[PDB]
Design a protein around this ligand. Structure first.
Ligand SMILES: C[C@@H]1NC(=O)c2csc(n2)[C@H](CSSc2ccc([N+](=O)[O-])cc2[N+](=O)[O-])NC(=O)c2csc(n2)[C@H](C)NC(=O)c2csc1n2
Ligand SMILES: CC(C)CCC[C@@H](C)[C@H]1CC[C@H]2[C@@H]3CC=C4C[C@@H](OC(=O)CCC(=O)O)CC[C@]4(C)[C@H]3CC[C@]12C
Ligand SMILES: CC(C)CCC[C@@H](C)[C@H]1CC[C@H]2[C@@H]3CC=C4C[C@@H](OC(=O)CCC(=O)O)CC[C@]4(C)[C@H]3CC[C@]12C
Ligand SMILES: CC(C)CCC[C@@H](C)[C@H]1CC[C@H]2[C@@H]3CC=C4C[C@@H](OC(=O)CCC(=O)O)CC[C@]4(C)[C@H]3CC[C@]12C
Ligand SMILES: CC(C)CCC[C@@H](C)[C@H]1CC[C@H]2[C@@H]3CC=C4C[C@@H](OC(=O)CCC(=O)O)CC[C@]4(C)[C@H]3CC[C@]12C
Ligand SMILES: CC(C)CCC[C@@H](C)[C@H]1CC[C@H]2[C@@H]3CC=C4C[C@@H](OC(=O)CCC(=O)O)CC[C@]4(C)[C@H]3CC[C@]12C
Ligand SMILES: *SC[C@@H]1NC(=O)c2csc(n2)[C@H](C)NC(=O)c2csc(n2)[C@H](C)NC(=O)c2csc1n2
Length: 1157
């Protein structure tokens, strides 16, 4: 499924030179940094040699030194020259690498995309029938971008990474071969620890995801069943179920958070212990007078940077692997030789042809469905100038003879010859342009009528092509509205009708001046008004050349003189009609609202204290590191070096263990707070949504899938704005402020210099990221601009290949892609320049910092201990701040947008939902006066409905209404339980307005039955118990409801009824019994008034009688309102009054029998 080192197969000599120079620059830039460490080591050795000042006899003599301080000055001047030279070299080389690699990638991608479109627009139609279209286009858009990203940036930087790895290891083995081995021994431990912690975290995350998805099942269930849940008024039970299920997800997320934070703690402890071991074993050697402090530093740093690089070049291999995976398919689409080329110039040129088509034993079956044999041989011959008509159900599926005419497929064992010569030898393009074909649905292109006609053949003299357009149905529909020119017809803009689309397609076909014409479904589902003109145009085109017509309409059949119509694959004679039946027939959150939401003010003091401690440790690390270097640079008594070294190594170890315990505690408290916040947010969001109203649920913006994703994968992001985003800011301040205060105390000069320089590189990186993101957005904009013509061409491939215009779309694609070709190159150059400037600023800042430090030391202001402390507390503090900011769950987004969205959902208005504001009368007469009411759906108010209704209900009534279930035109049943709020018409129940009535009381008296009885995973007995939600639930009434609904005989099988859950579609229930238990659940509440509807029950044809008897018993027991399209049920209905828009108030028989069929 991959292909290695064939990608560059499309690379020219210039591209190969670009790649070679880029690789050389990557090698040089990778080797640069170990040389930086070597020069730093020599610098430290020189300072240690000069600043020893251990001789008290010469401490004052000769004005102290003032002679070899000049040597130090000269050595530091030449080292500053080394630093600035390597900086300039990197400044050139980084650009030479990135710009050249990205230019080569851009050229390769442009060639790949252009020739890939050329190849895909070359394959035969059968390939398109076998494969898909949407996935194919998304492949065109996505795989090319994957290849670009990979074989540009990532292969550009992988060579840098390996060059740094080799350079660092050569430096180490060259200078400190004793220390390098022990550093090599301790290095894999960090990687192994990281890997094992990552594996544990991944396992915990997967377990938590499954445990929560167990709850997500019921989350999705009672939101897809939201209508039934609201109607039955039992949201409390689902709230309880969701809380119980989330009780486990919270507990597993606790372990996940603990694992992640203790993983980071171990990652810090191992690093600190590595520093401890390295400097312990280096100090021992230095005291043994083997290695100098410079030789320890330049070897340790070189080895660690080498290991870091070889570990950091994982993504540049992952991206290359992904690019290879995409490139395999992209390349297999190319190089695929088609049976029909339509591009090769091979083929004889017959001129002055007649067109005596013929067919002899044409066997063909669609490769999409090879098992089904459509065509089983035909024998037929025609003469030029004689039209042939085919009549039947379809032309072999759908105009199979038409499809095979233009080489769109390949016949099996069949032979066809236009003039005695097989169509295999003739040129494909020549055959295509001598055959005219009109589609049943004439697709056009989002372009003017001028070019739409131009795509007929060669756009020639515009006056000549207009004269070609001068056929019938012109001069009226082409000038009045179309402004005589530049119509720009398309789905979007200047949209026309099929009556004119067919005519313009016919005009386009006549422009080509075909020799043989094919007609297929000229007026397939077209309006009869547009008829009798398109037929006239077709006839006047027919009088010229031979044509074959297949159409359902009999008018063209009559018009045609010769008719060989048949069906079933068996040929029938031409000319006569014998034995041919002819029946006529969102704003950003303020971030204090989130903290107020996280009301647990405990669990945060401990976290803040731990974060402050951990942030303050890194400056203490810099202090101890500076002291370690100072022990040898500004050395004193040789016998105290051992004690100082042991103390400082023990200090590293103590710092490591205290940092590890700091993350243990901080992670415990912050993860606990985050998980409890997530559980609270999920519970409250579910409560708010179940309180929410039917109108809000019906809003198509709140699609159930997106809503469930918001409940699941968005309510857990807020963990990243009150948690990590509170810990990281305090850690960063306790790091940087503590570093800068110590720097100000000791080396305020160098402190100000470095604190003025560091913001420059910081803002340079920030602006680099901004401009890169902006350029990527713009490039995606033009890429989608090209993708519109790409998809417009690919979607209508059948038509564009039926027409001979094939290279036109390739040329248009090239023209559309030309601009992104230059945009990519300009973006590549900009990225190269900014990368080179950021690296050059880093190295030049390093050089200037040590040059100023050397000046100050020569001036005898601060020692090298202080210089190194200030430097390593200002720069390495900022780098650690950047790393800690990077290691955060993204406060910018994923957290900021999700948090505000769910805050809006939580603070949503309550639209006539459950509340204490309600009247609950103790009597219920069961009378509703549904008259003088008008209502429109809030989701689609543009279509006014439900106008002029007068209804009256009494006790024992069996009111039967007729309303369209399509679009829910009969929404009276919906309005009864206040699914929607009436705007003008008032409804009075028992002489009381429902507005003052309690919503729960109203919904506790309405036995509604839906069309499709959606079912939960709950057992059958408790499903029946669902009727009496928020009421007394017990047993031996479910049995009574079952007896009433006549389900006892069916539930005799597995009579337990308690474990018979319909889970996994287990214990399956068919439609009839599911409806029967739906009415059972309606009845178990024992409501005074019932609503019913039966739509698909009539499909059962067996349970109809049982469900009708159950409904009969229910309605004789109590008043029932029925609305259904089934006239059979109402025929049965007895005490009824048909009403339609208030027009009828009695039996259909009583007035005109409009009600009866
Ligand atoms: C988890 C993650 N780590 C890194 O992103 C990272 C990459 S590099 C590195 N750290 C070097 C060692 S390099 S690890 C190592 C250590 C030893 C050896 N070896 O050859 O023995 C090799 C390697 N190696 O694989 O490169 N770190 C230092 O110099 C150093 C001194 S204080 C300090 N870090 C503080 C405690 N950490 C942070 O502020 C911080 C924030 S986020 C984070 N760390
Ligand atoms: C060692 C340092 C100090 C001197 C660096 C010299 C470079 C400026 C040279 C080295 C190899 C050269 C290149 C070698 C080959 C070409 C191919 C050539 O590609 C084209 O044909 C595009 C022409 C166009 O602009 O239309 C453009 C210049 C380039 C990259 C050369 C430009 C300049 C390069 C990078
Ligand atoms: C000033 C020189 C001696 C030292 C520094 C070298 C690089 C910083 C510059 C100088 C000349 C530049 C080249 C001059 C001209 C071109 C052609 C131009 O590309 C094109 O117009 C077409 C390239 C293609 O698509 O093949 C941009 C890249 C390139 C190679 C440039 C790449 C970057 C180069 C090598
Ligand atoms: C990261 C994993 C894979 C290995 C980490 C090893 C470190 C945790 C060990 C290795 C050597 C140890 C050091 C070896 C010797 C000493 C001296 C000793 O300290 C003293 O004060 C004793 C002085 C003396 O009696 O000589 C004990 C602690 C210390 C710093 C040890 C601290 C812990 C170190 C750095
Ligand atoms: C006399 C001494 C004590 C003066 C101390 C100066 C402090 C009051 C200033 C100097 C630099 C500031 C820091 C510069 C950088 C940042 C930005 C920010 O760090 C981030 O990475 C934020 C990331 C994000 O939330 O997007 C948090 C505050 C912090 C640490 C600042 C906290 C306040 C600091 C330490
Ligand atoms: C546009 C971006 C990449 C910033 C570019 C900055 C560099 C051009 C500057 C910043 C700091 C400068 C350095 C700061 C201090 C010194 C010491 C200074 O003194 C000498 O070396 C003495 C020279 C003499 O008199 O012979 C001049 C060179 C050097 C390395 C400077 C070289 C030029 C550097 C690298
Ligand atoms: S060790 C690999 C490489 N390290 C250096 O380049 C380097 C030279 S000096 C030095 N690090 C001092 C000892 N480092 C710090 O003070 C320090 C504090 S925080 C920090 N470094 C962050 C964690 N470092 C990195 O992310 C990092 C990437 S490569 C690298 N260090």
């Amino acid at each position: 499924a991959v292909s290695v080192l064939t990608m560059f197969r499309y690379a020219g000599w210039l591209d190969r030179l670009y790649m070679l120079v880029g690789t050389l620059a990557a090698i040089i830039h990778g080797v640069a940094l170990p040389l930086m460490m070597l020069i730093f080591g020599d610098m430290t050795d020189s300072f240690a040699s000069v600043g020893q000042v251990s001789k008290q006899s010469t401490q004052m003599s000769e004005a102290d030194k003032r002679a070899m301080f000049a040597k130090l000055e000269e050595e530091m001047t030449t080292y500053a020259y080394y630093y600035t030279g390597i900086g300039a070299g990197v400044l050139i080389v980084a650009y030479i690498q990135v710009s050249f690699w990205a230019l080569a990638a851009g050229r390769q991608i442009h060639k790949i995309r252009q020739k890939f479109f050329h190849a895909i627009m070359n394959q035969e139609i059968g390939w398109f029938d076998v494969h898909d279209v949407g996935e194919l286009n998304t492949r065109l858009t996505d795989d090319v971008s994957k290849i670009n990203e990979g074989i540009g940036d990532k292969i550009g930087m992988f060579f840098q990474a390996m060059a740094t790895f080799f350079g660092g290891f050569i430096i180490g083995f060259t200078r400190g071969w004793k220390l390098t081995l022990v550093i090599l021994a301790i290095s894999p431990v960090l990687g192994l620890s990281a890997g094992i912690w990552a594996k544990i975290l991944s396992s915990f995350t997967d377990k938590e995801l499954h445990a929560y998805a167990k709850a997500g099942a019921v989350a999705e269930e009672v939101l897809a069943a939201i209508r039934t849940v609201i109607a039955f008024g039992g949201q409390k039970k689902e709230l309880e179920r969701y809380n119980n299920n989330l009780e486990e997800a919270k507990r597993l997320g606790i372990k996940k958070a603990i694992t992640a934070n203790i993983s980071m703690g171990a990652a810090f402890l191992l690093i600190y212990a590595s520093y401890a071991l390295a400097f312990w074993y280096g100090t021992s050697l230095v005291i043994s007078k083997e290695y100098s402090i410079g030789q320890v530093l330049t070897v340790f740093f070189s080895v660690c940077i080498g290991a870091f690089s070889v570990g950091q070049a994982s993504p540049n291999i992952e991206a290359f692997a992904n690019a290879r995976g995409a490139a395999y398919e992209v390349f297999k689409i190319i190089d695929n030789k088609p049976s029909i080329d339509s591009f090769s110039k091979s083929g004889h040129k017959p001129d002055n042809i007649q067109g005596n088509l013929e067919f002899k034993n044409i066997h063909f079956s669609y490769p999409s469905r090879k098992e089904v044999q459509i065509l089983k041989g035909l024998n037929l011959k025609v003469k030029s100038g004689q039209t042939v008509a085919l009549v039947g159900n379809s032309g072999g599926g759908k105009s199979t003879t038409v499809q095979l005419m233009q080489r769109l497929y390949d016949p099996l064992d069949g032979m066809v010859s236009i003039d005695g010569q097989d169509i295999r030898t003739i040129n494909v393009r020549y055959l295509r342009e001598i055959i005219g074909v009109v589609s049943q649905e004439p697709v056009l292109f989002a372009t003017t009528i001028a070019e739409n006609i131009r795509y007929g053949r060669e756009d020639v003299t515009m006056d000549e092509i207009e004269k070609a357009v001068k056929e019938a149905n012109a001069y009226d529909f082409i000038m009045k509205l179309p402004h005589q020119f530049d119509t720009l017809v398309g789905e979007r803009g200047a949209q026309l009708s099929g009556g004119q689309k067919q005519r313009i397609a016919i005009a386009r076909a006549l422009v080509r001046n075909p020799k043989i014409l094919l007609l297929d479904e000229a007026t397939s589902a077209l309006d009869t008004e547009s008829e009798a003109v398109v037929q006239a145009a077709l006839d006047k085109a027919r009088e010229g050349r031979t044509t074959i017509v297949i159409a359902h309409r009999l008018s063209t059949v009559r018009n045609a003189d010769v008719i060989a119509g048949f069906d079933g694959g068996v040929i029938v004679e031409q000319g006569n009609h014998d034995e041919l039946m002819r029946e006529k027939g969102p704003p950003a959150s303020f971030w204090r609202i989130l903290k107020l939401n996280s009301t647990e003010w405990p669990y945060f003091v401990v976290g803040i204290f731990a974060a402050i401690i951990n942030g303050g440790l890194q400056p203490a690390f810099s202090v101890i590191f500076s002291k370690v270097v100072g022990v040898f640079t500004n050395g004193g008594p040789p016998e105290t070096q051992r004690q100082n070294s042991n103390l400082f190594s023990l200090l590293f170890l103590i710092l490591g263990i205290i940092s590890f315990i700091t993350f243990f505690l901080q992670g415990f408290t912050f993860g606990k707070a985050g998980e409890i916040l997530t559980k609270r947010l999920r519970y409250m969001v579910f409560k708010s949504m179940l309180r929410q109203d039917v109108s809000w649920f019906d809003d198509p913006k709140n699609t159930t899938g997106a809503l469930t994703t918001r409940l699941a994968n968005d309510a857990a992001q807020v963990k990243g704005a009150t948690g990590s985003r509170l810990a990281v800011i305090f850690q960063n301040i306790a790091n940087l402020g503590t570093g800068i205060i110590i720097s100000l105390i000791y080396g305020w000069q160098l402190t100000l210099l470095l604190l003025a320089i560091v913001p420059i590189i910081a803002i340079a990186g920030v602006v680099e990221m901004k401009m890169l993101s902006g350029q990527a957005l713009k490039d995606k904009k033009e890429l989608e601009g090209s993708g519109k013509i790409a998809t417009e061409a690919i979607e209508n491939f059948r038509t564009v290949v039926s027409l001979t215009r094939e290279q036109k779309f390739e040329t248009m694609y090239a023209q559309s892609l030309q601009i992104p070709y230059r945009n990519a190159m300009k973006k590549a150059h900009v990225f190269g320049i900014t990368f080179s400037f950021t690296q050059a600023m880093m190295y030049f800042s390093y050089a200037a910092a040590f040059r100023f430090g050397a000046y100050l030391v020569t001036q005898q202001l601060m020692t090298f201990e202080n210089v190194l402390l200030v430097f390593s507390a200002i720069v390495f503090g900022a780098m650690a701040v950047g790393q800690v900011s990077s290691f955060a769950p993204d406060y910018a987004k994923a957290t900021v947008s999700a948090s505000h969205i769910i805050r809006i959902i939580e603070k949503t208005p309550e639209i006539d939902s459950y509340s204490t504001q309600g009247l609950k009368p103790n009597m219920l007469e069961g009378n509703v006066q549904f008259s003088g009411v008008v209502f429109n759906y809030p989701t689609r108010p543009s279509i006014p409905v439900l106008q002029g209704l007068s209804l009256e209900v009494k006790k024992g009534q069996t009111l039967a209404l007729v309303g369209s279930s399509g679009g829910g035109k009969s929404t009276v049943v919906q309005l009864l339980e206040r699914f929607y709020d009436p705007m003008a018409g008032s409804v009075f129940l028992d002489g009381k307005e429902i507005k003052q009535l309690n919503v729960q009381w109203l919904r506790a008296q309405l036995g509604i039955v839906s069309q499709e009885p959606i079912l939960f995973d709950r057992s059958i007995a408790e499903n029946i118990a669902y009727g009496d939600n928020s009421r007394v639930v017990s047993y031996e009434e479910i049995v009574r409801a079952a007896k009433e609904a006549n389900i006892h005989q069916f539930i005799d099988s597995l009579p337990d009824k308690y474990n018979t859950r319909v889970g996994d579609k287990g214990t399956q229930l068919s439609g009839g019994q599911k409806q029967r238990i739906a009415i059972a659940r309606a009845l178990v509440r024992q409501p005074h008034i019932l609503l019913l509807d039966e739509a698909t029950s009539a499909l059962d044809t067996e349970s109809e009688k049982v469900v009708q008897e159950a409904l009969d018993k229910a309605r004789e027991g109590r008043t029932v309102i029925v609305i259904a399209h089934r006239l059979s049920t109402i025929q049965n209905a007895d005490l009824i009054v048909v009403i339609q828009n208030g027009k009828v108030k009695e039996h259909g028989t009583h007035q005109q029998l409009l009600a009866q069929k």
